[PDB]
Design a protein around this ligand. Structure first.
Ligand SMILES: Nc1ncnc2c1ncn2[C@@H]1O[C@H](COP(=O)(O)O)[C@@H](O)[C@H]1O
Ligand SMILES: Nc1ncnc2c1ncn2[C@@H]1O[C@H](COP(=O)(O)O)[C@@H](O)[C@H]1O
Ligand SMILES: [Mg+2]
Lengths: 178, 178
């Protein structure tokens, strides 16, 4: 698939960033090459329409690199985008959820009025690793009584088993690395 | 302008967040309403094409809320988007710049290969307040020997004199509040 190739050739890997042991996958070149960015959005949108038909109400983009894909994906689908943020950034009543990151803990947050009960959402981030971030996003959406139809990313790190962590919520990635 | 009205009517204002006396301008409803988001991007793109013609090489989006608008704006103009991030987030060789934020300092950072000398860029963020954030972005881009043609935002808080801070770099906002 030549479209998928346009995305894969624009991921660059950095060993031992930001700390020894981690291989950082940088999506920055995807954003800088408009053909690559369009390809990524199109592949995601095609997968989602093929899997869900007209059942998706909103895209939810995750702070911060998910913000890079969420609005464009939503627009391609004719949908709105809701935001899930790092704690402390959103005004009005919120809910929050932790999930260890690094050697400690961190929290995502959503506005209590971001969605109505029963609304169906697809969550997008750039990369799925342990699944902690996406899992916290699903927890928050679930607490608003929203139905998470699927989580998607450009990149999945399969040895970290984030897919199993999200089960039974379906997951889809464009590219997989160990 | 009916398009501009579509954006204006989706800015929600929260008094006393995060501190008493400040009014937080929340762009979330713009993202959530696909017609509003499309109107915002179209208004920005129309302004930039009319102002700069073919001079723009790249859009630069600012972490984090600028990430919500940068890629869509770039796609609308047929351009790539480069990223300016909170320090410590980007791999590889970088430049960073401090600036004042609230009661302390913060730092932005850009990859040294984000742009080549002579390339022309427009910076986008959701909102211009003091201008410290946009000013640091301009400094970083200048240090790569890039030319900043303009900075743009959805919202500008005119009493904080951000425009004046950025001068002589031109600036444009869709909406203005005191
Ligand atoms: N190796 C990596 N390269 C780039 N980003 C990563 C990497 N591991 C984790 N992330 C980021 O951290 C979050 C995923 O981590 P996790 O919560 O473990 O699934 C996403 O928001 C990613 O942007
Ligand atoms: N009243 C406000 N409402 C919403 N966001 C704000 C407000 N003031 C500052 N910001 C955010 O902080 C940054 C601009 O601050 P400044 O550097 O003071 O121009 C932008 O990235 C804005 O998103
Ligand atoms: Mg992230």
């Amino acid at each position: 698939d030549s479209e998928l190739q346009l995305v894969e050739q624009r991921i660059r890997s950095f060993p031992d960033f930001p700390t020894p042991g981690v291989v950082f996958r940088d999506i920055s070149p995807v954003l800088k090459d408009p053909a690559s960015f369009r390809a990524a959005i199109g592949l995601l949108a095609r997968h989602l329409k093929a899997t869900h038909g007209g059942r998706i109400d909103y895209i939810a983009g995750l702070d911060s690199r998910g913000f890079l894909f969420g609005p464009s994906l939503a627009q391609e689908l004719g949908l709105g985008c809701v935001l899930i943020r790092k704690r402390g950034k959103l005004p009005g009543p919120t809910l929050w959820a932790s999930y260890s990151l690094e050697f400690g803990k961190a929290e995502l947050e959503i506005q209590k009025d971001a969605l109505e009960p029963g609304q169906r959402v697809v969550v997008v981030d750039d990369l799925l690793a342990t699944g902690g971030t996406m899992n916290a996003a699903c927890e928050l959406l679930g607490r608003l009584q929203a139905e998470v139809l699927e989580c998607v990313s450009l990149v999945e790190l399969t040895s970290l088993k984030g897919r199993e962590k999200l089960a039974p919520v379906p997951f889809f990635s464009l590219l997989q690395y160990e």
